[PDB]
Amino acid sequence: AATGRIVAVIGAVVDVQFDEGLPPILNALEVQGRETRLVLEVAQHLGESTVRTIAMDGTEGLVRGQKVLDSGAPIKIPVGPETLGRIMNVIGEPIDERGPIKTKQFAAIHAEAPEFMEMSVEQEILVTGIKVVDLLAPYAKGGKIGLFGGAGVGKTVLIMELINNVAKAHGGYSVFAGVGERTREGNDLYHEMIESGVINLKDATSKVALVYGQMNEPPGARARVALTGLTVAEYFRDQEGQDVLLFIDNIFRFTQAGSEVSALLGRIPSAVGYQPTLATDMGTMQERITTTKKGSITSVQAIYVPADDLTDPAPATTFAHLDATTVLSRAIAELGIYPAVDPLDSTSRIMDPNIVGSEHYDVARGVQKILQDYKSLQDIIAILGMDELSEEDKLTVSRARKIQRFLSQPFQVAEVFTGHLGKLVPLKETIKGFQQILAGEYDHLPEQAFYMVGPIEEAVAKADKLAEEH
Amino acid sequence: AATGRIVAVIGAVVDVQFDEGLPPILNALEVQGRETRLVLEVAQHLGESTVRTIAMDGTEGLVRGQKVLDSGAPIKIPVGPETLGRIMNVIGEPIDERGPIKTKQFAAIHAEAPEFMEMSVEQEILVTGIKVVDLLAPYAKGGKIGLFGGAGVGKTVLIMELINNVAKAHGGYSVFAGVGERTREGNDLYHEMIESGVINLKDATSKVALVYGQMNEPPGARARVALTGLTVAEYFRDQEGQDVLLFIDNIFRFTQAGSEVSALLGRIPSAVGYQPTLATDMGTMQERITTTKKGSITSVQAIYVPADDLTDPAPATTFAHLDATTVLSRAIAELGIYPAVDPLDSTSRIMDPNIVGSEHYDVARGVQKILQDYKSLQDIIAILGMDELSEEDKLTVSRARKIQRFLSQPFQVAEVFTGHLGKLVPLKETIKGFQQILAGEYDHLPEQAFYMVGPIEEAVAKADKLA
Amino acid sequence: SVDLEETGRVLSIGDGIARVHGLRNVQAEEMVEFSSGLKGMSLNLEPDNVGVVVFGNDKLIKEGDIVKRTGAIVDVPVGEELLGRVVDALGNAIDGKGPIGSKTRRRVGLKAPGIIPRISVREPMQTGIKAVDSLVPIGRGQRELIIGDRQTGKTSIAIDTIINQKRFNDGTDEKKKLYCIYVAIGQKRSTVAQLVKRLTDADAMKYTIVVSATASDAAPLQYLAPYSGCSMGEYFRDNGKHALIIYDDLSKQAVAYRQMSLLLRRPPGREAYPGDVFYLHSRLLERAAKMNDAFGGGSLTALPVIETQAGDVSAYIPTNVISITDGQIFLETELFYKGIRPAINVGLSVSRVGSAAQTRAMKQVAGTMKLELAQYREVAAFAQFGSDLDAATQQLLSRGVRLTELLKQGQYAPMAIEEQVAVIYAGVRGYLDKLEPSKITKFENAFLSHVISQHQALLGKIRADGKISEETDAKLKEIVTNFLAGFEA
Amino acid sequence: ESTTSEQSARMTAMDNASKNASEMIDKLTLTFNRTRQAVITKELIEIISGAAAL
C-alpha cells in the first residue's frame, strides 16, 4: 500500500517518503524487513510527499531506503473481553508469553472525544476506606481521580492500595496502563494480581487488563500506551455497558515523552522545556477518559510532580482535568504519616454539604481549619517556646497533632513496608472518630495511640496497651 | 510616491516590497484600500527591495499585494498651538471627535536630540508653586521627574495642578502623553481636566494637549506615542520658546511596548526579556527632553516598578535619566496632607547647595531632620508616652507637626470642590515660612493654623481667625 | 489549471499548522475552508505560502488538499436568541437544543469603543457576595480580575454573580437587568456540564450564554472563544442592554495563543509567550465599556479569571492582565482553609472604580467597615498573643473578628444589597461586639430571616430609596437592637 | 526589680531580633530579585537556543 522508503533516521523520529498517496496523519506505518514489528505513526506531512513519523519501538538497524508499508488505519489493538488477564504492548501485542490475544474486535488507539451532550452530571461517592481521602477529599464514582505526588512519596503504593480495596470489590472490569514506570513494578503487579485472583491464568474470570509501556520503551512508545489503555477502557464502556476502572501510573510520562521528541519533530520549545502542544495533547487524551451517559469510567491517574514543584506545567495542566485531587506531600511522609496526603491541598468537587452531608462537610472543614491554625501556631512556637503558648494554643496544637496522626492509616499493600496489618475504615467511622477528636473526647489519650491505627476504637485500644506496657 | 506592495502579513509585522526607490528606516507607509488609516513605520531593510515594517493599527484585512504609499518622512503629527485642548493618537489624527486639528505646520515624531552646543550648562529649579516639591524635592528645569504612586494618592489632581501652575507662573503649556492608557481612565482624565479648567472646550484657554496611546492599539503605536507627545511639546520649546511639561504616564508601558516591538521584529531578547536596545531607546526618548537655548521641556514621568524590583532593567534604565522623585504616599493621604507627597522619601538631584542656594539647602535639610527625628521618636511616644519624652522632644514634635501640616497646600484645580482658593506659594515664601517654623517663631501658633494654608501669613491669619 | 487566487493546496500540514500554497487573495485573519470540511484561519500570510491554523484534528487534512476562501473574517452568531444556549467558539450550538435563531452575525475582531463614546461607570453591578459588594465594589463597565491560585474559589465568585442577577433580571425594571455570558476556555466538558446544570437549577440559564472551548477543542477555538463571547456581549452593550462576561481561565487562552504562535514559528519571548500576548488580552478586555447615553447607555462588564501559580502575581500573563484590568479580587488558599470562605484577601483586592460603583447605603456602611477592618489588619499580628495589649488594640481585634465573621458567605447563596446593608449595619455600628465570635454567623442568618420576613418594608426602603435615611437608621437601630436582645436563647 | 529588668531586657532583645531579621530580609530580597531575573534570562536563552537550532 503506497510502499514508502525511509529517508532519515534521527533518534526516534523517522522520515518516510511515499511515492504513492501520502498516508494521513496518525495512521500506522509498518517497517518491512525487521525481525520484530516496528510501527511508525505519522506525525507531520513535511512536504514533497514525505511524512515525519515517530517510531513505536527501537530505531536501531533501520537503513535509509528500507521499505515501509501503510496500514491505512491508526494503530489498532486487540480489544474485547479476551484482553482481560492479558498483558499487551502499545501496538497491542501480547507480552505475557501466553499466545495471541484472540479478540474479534479491533479498535484504533486514536479516537474523538465524547461530546458535551454525552456528559453525565451525576456525582456519587466512592468509599475507598482511607480516612484522609474519604473525609477530606472524597472520591466520586465515575469521576477522574488524581494522585499528585513527587518521587518516593506514595503514589504507586496508594494506587495499588486503591486497586486492592476498590477494584477487587468492584464487579466491573478494570484496566491498568503502566505508562513510563519501572518494569519491576509491572511484574510485581502482574504476579500480585495472579495470586490475588484478579487475573486467572487458568479460567476466564480475570477482571483486569494490563497495558504496559515501561521506561525501557522508546519515547514514542511511552506517549501512546496511555491511549491504548484508555481505548481498552472505552471498549469496556461503549461496546459493553459496564463500569470500568482505568488505573494509569505516572500519566506525567505521557507529557514527558512528547517533550523528548518535540525538538526532533521541529517545534520551538515552550516554557521550562515542554512541547508547545502540551495542554492540547493532554486534553485530547484526558477528554476521552470520561464517564459518558452510556457507561462510567472511574479513572485513578498517578501524576509525578517534577522536583515536587506543583507549579510545573505538566502537573499544573492536569489539575483542571481531574474532579478529585489528592496531593502527597513529602514533608508529611518525612513526618511518617502514611498515606502522605496533604490535608490542606487535596480537593474534591463532591466536597459539598449538599452532597457529602452536613456532618461530613462540617467535620472535614473543621479538621482543615484546625490544621491551618496549627500551621500558624508553629511559627510562634519556633520563637516563643512550647512552654510559652497559651493553654488554648497548646490545646489546639495537641488536637491538631492527634488529628494528623489519626490521618495515617496502615495499608494492606504496605504491610510489607510498615509491618502493621492493613486496616479499612468505613466512612461513618472516619467521620465519627474525627468528630470526636475535634470535640476533645479523646484528649486524655496520647498522640502515639492515634498513629498507624484504623478506627478510633483501635486508637483507644492501642493507648491501653501502652499503659499496660508502661 | 513609490507605491509598494505588501508581500507578507505576519501579526503586526507587515512587509512591503517597493519596486521603486525603497523608503528609509523610520518612515511612514500609508496602506491604500483601508477604511481606517493604517500607517506602517519602516524598521528594517531586508534586501530584495523589501522593507519590514511595524503597524500602528490593526493588521487584519490586509491582502498580499495591497498597495501602500510612502509618506517620505517619519510619522508627521499636527503640531502647533491648536493641539491644546485636543486628544490625538500616535499618527496625529484627532480622537476627541472635535473635528480636525487645523494647525499651520506638522513635525515628524522621530527627531534627533539637541546637540552639545544647544545644551544649557546651568542647572535651574522649575518652581511649581507646591511647597513640598519646591522645598524638599525641587524640580529641575529641563530634567525628568519620577512620579511614584498610583491611585488614591491624588496623582491626577497633582498633575493638573502642575499644569495650571506652570501655565500661570512660567507661562508654559503642557503635553500629556498617555502610553498604554486604559480607555476608561483616559475618558475620566479628559472629563476631570475639563471640569478643572486646564482644558477649555468653549474657547482657546486650554493649557494641555492630550496624546492617548490606549492599550487596544498595537505595540508599535504605544511605543511611539511618547515620541508623538514629545514632538508636540518640542514645538513649544523651540518655536515658542516656552517651558513645557511632558507628562508620560507609566514610562514602564513605553519600555514594555519597545520590548514587544523588538520581540515581533525577532531580535534576541536581552536579560529578563526586555528589548536588546532598551538603553538606546530610552536614551533616544529622554535626551530630547532637555533644556535648549530657546527653552526647556521638563517631564514628569510616572514610573511602574515590576515585581517591586528597583534593580529590574526597566526601573534601572529609567532611573539613570531621572533627576527627581515624587512619592505620593497613601499614609500621607491618610493623615490628610494634600498633596500627599512623602517629604522624607521624595528626593531630588539638584538638592545641593551649589544649585539650590545655601538658604534653600539649609531649610530643606532642616525640615528633613525635623521630620526624621519626629518619626524616630514617634515609636518612643507610642511605647512609653508623650509625658515620657524630654522637653526638647516635646518641642520637636510640635514643630514637626506644624511642618507636616504646613506641607499641605490647597490646589486651584480642586478649588471648585474643596471651597478653598488654591495658592501658588513662591519659593521665597516657602523658604521663609519653613525657616520660621524651624526657628520656633510660630511655636505658639496652633497646629491647625498651619494645615491647608498657603504663605505663613495665611497661617498666622488663620490662627487669628480660629475661635 | 488551479487559479491559486481563491483556492490553494496544502504544502505541509502538521501540529495543527497548514502551510498552504496559493490563496494569493486571502485577507489576513480571514477564515478559509479545507477540503475535508474543517475550517481554518489565515494568520501568517508569508510571501510564498499562507500559514493557516486548523480548527480541527489534522488527520483529515493532508498535503495537496484544496483550501478555499470563505471571503470573510471570523464572525459568530450574535443576538438574544443565544440566551440560554451553550455554544462553541464559532457559535455553533452544542447543547443539542436545535439551531440558534440568531439573525445577526457580528465580527469578533471589532475594535473597542473610543474615549468619547464611553462614560464614567456609576451603576453598581451587584455580585451578591458581601465581601465583593462592600469592600471590592464592581460597577457595570468595569474590568475586574478574579485572580487567585488553583482551587481557591475563582469560578464560584463568578457563578454566584450570574445567579444573583436573577433577582434583577426577573424584575420588570429594565435598567437593572444584566444578561450574563460565561466563556469556558480549557475547562473539561464534565466541568462545563456541571456548571450549566447548576445554572439551570438556579434558573439562571434563561439570561446566560455559555460559550465553551474545552481542552479537546483545537487551540484556535480556545483562542477565539473569548473574542466570540465578547462580540456576543457587545450586542447588548451596543443596544442599550447591560451585559456581564466571565472569561474563566484567560490564562488557558494565552496558552492556546502561545501554541499557535510557536507552531507558526512566530518569534518567542518570555515564557515562550509571543510578544503580542499583551495585545491579545488588551484588545479583548478593552471592549468592556460603559457607553454614554448617546450610544445607547449599555454596559459590558468583564470578569476575567487568571490562575496564579503559587501566588506568582509577577508572571507574564498575570502582570499583563493585572495591568489591563481595573482592579483585582485576590483569593488566597490560606484563607480558604482558615474558615474565610470566600477567600477574598481584602488587602490585596482593590477596585479602581471604588465607591462610585456602590449604592449610597452600601457606601455608608462599607466605608466604616473598610476603616475598621484595615485597622484590624494593622493590629492583626498582636491577636495571637495580644491579650496583654492596650484596650484600643483589643477593641480593634474584636471588631475585626466580628467583621470577618460577617463577611463569610455560603457558596451558591447570593445575597441582596439590602440584606447585605442590614448585616453590615449590624456589624459596623457595634451591636455584635458583645456576641461571641462563633455566634456571629448564626446571628447573621437569624437576623436575615427576621428582617426579611417581619420588616420587608425597611428592606424596600433601602432598595428603593437607595440610602440609609435618618429614619431608616433609627428604624434599623430599633430592629437590630430588639432582635439582638432576643436572639440569644 | 527582677521582673521589671526581665521585661525591659525581653523588649530590647525582641527589638534587636526584629532589626536583625530586617537586615537579613533586605539581603535575601536582593538575592531573590537577582535570582528571579537570572531565571527569566536563562529560560529566555534556552528558548532562543532551541529556536535557532531549528
Ligand SMILES: Nc1ncnc2c1ncn2[C@@H]1O[C@H](COP(=O)(O)OP(=O)(O)OP(=O)(O)O)[C@@H](O)[C@H]1O
Ligand atoms: N463560600 C464558600 N463556602 C464554602 N465552600 C466553598 C465556598 N466557595 C468555594 N467553596 C468550595 O471550593 C471548592 C472548589 O472551589 P472552586 O472549584 O469554585 O474554585 P476555583 O479556584 O475556581 O477552582 P479551579 O481553578 O480548580 O477550577 C468547592 O468544592 C466548594 O465546595
Ligand SMILES: Nc1ncnc2c1ncn2[C@@H]1O[C@H](COP(=O)(O)OP(=O)(O)O)[C@@H](O)[C@H]1O
Ligand atoms: N503506607 C505507605 N504508603 C506509601 N508509601 C510507604 C508506606 N509505607 C512505607 N512507604 C514507603 O514509601 C515509598 C513510596 O514509594 P512509591 O509509591 O513506590 O514511589 P512513588 O512515591 O514515586 O510512587 C515506598 O517505596 C515505601 O518504601
Ligand SMILES: [Mg+2]
Ligand atoms: Mg512508584
Ligand SMILES: [Mg+2]
Ligand atoms: Mg475553576
